[PDB]
């Protein structure tokens, strides 16, 4: 299983900075990364970055290197293998050319060569 409910469909104007929420269920939130993906209209899909809900380590593309703040808060044990977590997304020098749908997706496996690969996605959020 696994769910990743996302925040509302925010609507602001250039210069601002908005926060996107990703809330997880049905799986251990610490065991897999959290990826942030962007599907703009005037470009191909762009992988923004992933962050480690266990180690706190983060990794993002150079097109977002000093513009995005990725954060997660600690999970809440539900059962031995089920918890609830949350992941946050922010943009700095924000304009209106960054408009589109924003997705959150967790990693694929816990080890190997495709650990962080975005496997299970959220329903997305429309923006400005």
């Amino acid at each position: 299983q696994g769910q990743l409910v996302q925040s509302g469909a925010t609507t602001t104007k250039p210069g601002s900075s908005v926060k996107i929420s990703c809330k997880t269920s049905g799986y251990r939130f610490n065991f897999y990364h959290i990826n942030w993906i962007r599907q703009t209209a005037g470009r191909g899909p762009e992988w923004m970055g992933w962050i480690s809900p266990y180690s706190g380590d983060k990794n993002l593309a150079p097109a977002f290197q000093d513009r995005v703040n990725m954060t997660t808060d600690t999970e809440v044990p539900v059962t031995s293998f089920t918890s609830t977590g949350a992941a946050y997304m922010e943009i700095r020098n924000l304009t209106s050319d960054d408009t589109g749908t924003y997705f959150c997706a967790k990693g694929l496996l816990r080890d190997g060569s495709s650990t962080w690969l975005p496997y299970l996605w959220g329903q997305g959020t429309l923006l400005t």
Partner: protein, 133 residues
């Protein structure tokens, strides 16, 4: 290197815990469990001593009738009936922990123990026929 300790990788992936099996193996008959006095503590310690050798010998007897005496990792000739688990190799050894694996494989663990048992008895029957020449 790592060396997490006894049960140290119980939350790790099956492929990662499978490299540190000797860690759990040696702690199955030691602990701290000389005269035998039958005091309230003395009876308690005697039961703790008999119990450990009992549960240890049951597991070794299973490894024996499977042809896996003295092995921490032995391979078999029982093919994996996908109705036990249709999961793939990577989504097991690089994803699941032995605890959550044991949870979903628990129903068929008796079926598997019988196929391993008769695979070894038929195997030892073949090895005798091959050496009959």
């Amino acid at each position: 290197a790592v060396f997490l300790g006894f049960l140290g990788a119980a939350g790790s992936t099956m492929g990662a815990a499978s490299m540190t099996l000797t860690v759990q193996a040696r702690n199955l008959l030691s602990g701290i469990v000389h005269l035998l006095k039958l005091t309230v503590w003395g009876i308690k310690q005697l039961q703790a001593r008999v119990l450990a050798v009992e549960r240890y010998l049951r597991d070794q007897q299973l490894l024996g009738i499977w042809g896996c005496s003295g092995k921490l990792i032995c391979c078999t000739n029982v093919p994996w009936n996908s109705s036990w688990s249709n999961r793939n190799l990577s989504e097991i050894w690089d994803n699941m922990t032995w605890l959550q694996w044991d949870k979903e494989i628990s129903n068929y663990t008796q079926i598997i123990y019988g196929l391993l048992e008769e695979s070894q008895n038929q195997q030892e029957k073949n090895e005798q026929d091959l050496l009959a020449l």
